[PDB]
Amino acid sequence: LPAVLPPLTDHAGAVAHLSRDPVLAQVTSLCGELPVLAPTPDPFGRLVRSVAGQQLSVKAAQAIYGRLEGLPGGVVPAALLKVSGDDLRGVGLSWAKVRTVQAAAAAAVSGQIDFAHLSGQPDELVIAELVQLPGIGRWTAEMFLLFALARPDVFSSGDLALRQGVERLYPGEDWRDVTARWAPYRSLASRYLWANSARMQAGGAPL
Ligand SMILES: [Cl-]
Ligand SMILES: [Cl-]
Ligand code: NI
């Protein structure tokens, strides 16, 4: 399994590499600079934030996470297991999200997922353990690696917007080929695809 790649601390190297693909050379200049993501010091809490926020507005997602934070002991595995399912529903969580959050806390306290020591685990091993939790598929696991853990080399082949972007920009090309070229910077390439979509949704000119 590939060795864990550290989070980028700056994007210059990444952008130069990606820019070797004339599509991304254009996309990166059109979209400009993207902020450098710092790996979270609290993976568990970021996992819970992600889960809790799914399908909610940005303000609603913040609110509900704040209500979780306000439970006794906060957003910590052992503390969340002492909160009843009725009180987790009570903060506004769907039953699906209650179950996922309970499942993630239980996995942390049982040692099934060592949220304190992910830094050394290959992407796929982190993915496989997250996937075993109810309500968390590969896509959620991959988004967590990319956005929470700031791993640099993640292309989520189940993200519809990424796949629609590759289809649009590279018609008739094998997506595995296209995206492999972006390695070891598939995460920033992914972020530029989403940025380009936002750019187009704002009225921008196409490539
Ligand atoms: Cl909900
Ligand atoms: Cl998922
Ligand atoms: Ni390179």
Side-chain angles (χ1 to χ4, degrees), residues 54 131 135-142:
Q54 279 172 351
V131 163
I136 296 183
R138 176 152 204 114
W139 180 83
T140 299
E142 289 178 326

Side-chain angles (χ1 to χ4, degrees), residues 136-202:
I136 296 183
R138 176 152 204 114
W139 180 83
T140 299
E142 289 178 326
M143 286 312 96
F144 177 75
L145 268 55
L146 193 164
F147 291 102
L149 305 190
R151 303 224 173 168
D153 196 28
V154 182
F155 181 82
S156 192
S157 71
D159 187 276
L160 182 63
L162 292 180
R163 296 292 298 277
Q164 284 175 337
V166 171
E167 145 177 81
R168 183 75 69 177
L169 295 183
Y170 311 81
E173 293 184 65
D174 180 352
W175 79 262
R176 299 187 177 269
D177 276 2
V178 171
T179 59
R181 184 172 181 179
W182 303 339
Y185 307 112
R186 274 174 293 185
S187 294
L188 188 64
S190 288
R191 292 177 63 204
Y192 274 109
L193 289 180
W194 287 313
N196 190 246
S197 171
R199 191 186 68 78
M200 293 310 290
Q201 287 176 249

Side-chain angles (χ1 to χ4, degrees), residues 51-56 64 89 92-95 97:
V51 169
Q54 279 172 351
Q55 288 74 57
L56 308 194
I64 196 159
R89 276 287 276 158
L93 292 176
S94 66
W95 284 112
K97 288 166 176 188

Side-chain angles (χ1 to χ4, degrees), residues 19-57:
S19 287
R20 293 174 70 155
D21 172 353
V23 171
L24 291 196
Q26 268 218 74
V27 161
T28 57
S29 65
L30 286 163
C31 294
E33 205 89 61
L34 299 181
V36 184
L37 308 182
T40 187
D42 183 18
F44 179 77
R46 286 290 296 284
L47 184 56
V48 166
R49 194 190 280 273
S50 163
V51 169
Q54 279 172 351
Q55 288 74 57
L56 308 194
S57 66

